[PDB]
Amino acid sequence: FVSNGTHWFVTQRNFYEPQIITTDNTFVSGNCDVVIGIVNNTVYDPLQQE
Amino acid sequence: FVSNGTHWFVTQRNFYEPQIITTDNTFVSGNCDVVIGIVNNTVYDPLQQE
């Protein structure tokens, strides 16, 4: 989860090539947890599809 | 991403277990023009099923 001060995006340790957080590109276990590092941002689910 | 002159499908480089080309087993990192060697097949995304 990386940001340029904004535009929080997701990429790997290969190239910047930023991507929208993209729920399918994340892993969820723990929900809003007491874990360090929550930046309180949101991710679009590709299947919102509203 | 391979075919035998017909159905487009993907199988691990390791063995031949073709999976019908699907968005589920593909990736995007930009614009089509940047790409080369493009079969340019339409991914059979299950969007229609949505």
From Swiss-Prot, chains A, B:
Protein name according to UniProt: Spike protein S2'
Consequence of changing residue 24 to H: In strain: Alpha/B.1.1.7
Gene: S
Physiological role: Subunit of the fusion protein that is processed upon entry into the host cell. Mediates fusion of the virion and cellular membranes by functioning as a class I viral fusion protein. Contains a viral fusion peptide that is unmasked after S2 cleavage. This cleavage can occur at the cell membrane by host TMPRSS2 or during endocytosis by host CSTL. In either case, this triggers an extensive and irreversible conformational change that leads to fusion of the viral envelope with the cellular cytoplasmic membrane, releasing viral genomic RNA into the host cell cytoplasm.
Glycosylation sites: 4, 40
Organism: Severe acute respiratory syndrome coronavirus 2 (2019-nCoV)
Effect in UniProt of substituting residue 7 to Y: In strain: Theta/P.3
